[PDB]
Structures are given as structure tokens and as C-alpha cells.
């Protein structure tokens, strides 16, 4: 199994696999949105890493087009930095739901969200915290879960 850690918050995201951090971003000016990592399901190696600023218009379309080309079976990791919902439209939301995500489809303004799941298979872990007020953010969430190698 892979030891996977996924952190989502206003100011910082990080992802680690088996003790190696494969993503860390705590910029103010950059990195906003949904960070997406694709792992090889047999080795845990990172095959692709992206960030879609879904706070901004049309970035969710790019995320959908990227997710479309991921082979069924790959491990997906999603994590929000700062804000990932403002221009997250219904098609992207529906796609995340079809990926088995509970909170993705329901993602709201300045919510936090961390997700690990196989494309075409089960979810391995998910956490979500709601912003309590418009000028506030969801509570940071720290998801630590085991991912079985295929």
C-alpha cells in the first residue's frame, strides 16, 4: 500500500506519498484552485501534476479536459488551495461526482477539500470543510490514507 497524505487549506496545499512530498505550494499570488495529481496505480509514481484555478473563469473546462484523458485505473488526488468553487460549473461538478467524490460536486466558496480515489474504482479517502462566512475559509483538512497498489 501507499501512504498518502493530502492537505487542503486557505494558504497551503501539500501532498506526500510514502514519506516523499510530491507537491507543496504556499504562495499567495499563485497556485489557487484545484490541484490534481495522477499516480501510477502499480508503483505510486506521479505521472502528472496540475493546478486549475477554478476560482477563475473557464479553468474548470481545462480540468475536465485533463481528467478525461486520464486512463481508468489511475489514482487521482485532488486538493484545494484557497478557493476552487467560484467558477466550478455543473459539468465539472458532475464529473467529480462520477469519480465518486461526495464533496467535490458540493464544493462552495472558500471551502477546503482533499480527495483520493481511483478513476473507475472506489474512493480511498475524502475530507471537506465548509467556509462559515464569506470572508472566512473552511478549516484546513489533513487526509492521511492507505492506497493499495493494483
Amino acid at each position: 500500500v501507499l501512504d498518502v497524505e493530502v492537505y487542503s487549506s486557505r494558504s497551503k496545499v501539500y501532498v506526500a506519498v510514502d514519506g516523499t512530498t510530491v507537491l507543496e505550494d504556499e504562495a499567495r499570488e499563485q497556485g489557487r484552485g484545484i490541484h490534481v495529481i495522477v499516480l501510477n496505480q502499480a508503483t505510486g509514481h506521479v505521472m502528472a501534476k496540475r493546478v486549475f484555478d477554478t476560482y477563475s473563469p473557464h479553468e474548470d473546462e481545462a480540468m475536465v479536459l485533463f481528467l478525461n484523458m486520464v486512463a481508468p485505473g489511475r489514482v487521482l488526488i485532488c486538493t484545494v488551495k484557497d478557493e476552487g468553487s467560484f467558477h466550478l460549473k455543473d459539468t465539472a461538478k458532475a464529473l467529480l461526482r462520477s469519480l465518486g467524490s461526495q464533496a467535490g460536486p458540493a464544493l462552495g466558496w472558500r471551502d477546503t477539500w482533499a480527495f483520493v480515489g481511483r478513476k473507475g474504482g472506489p474512493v480511498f479517502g475524502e475530507k471537506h470543510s465548509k467556509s462559515p462566512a464569506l470572508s472566512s475559509w473552511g478549516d484546513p483538512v489533513l487526509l492521511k490514507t492507505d492506497v493499495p497498489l493494483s
Partner: peptide, 5 residues
């Protein structure tokens, strides 16, 4: 870049 509200 739009901002609420």
C-alpha cells in the same frame, strides 16, 4: 478577474 459579489 471577477470577484464576488
Amino acid at each position: 478577474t471577477p470577484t464576488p459579489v
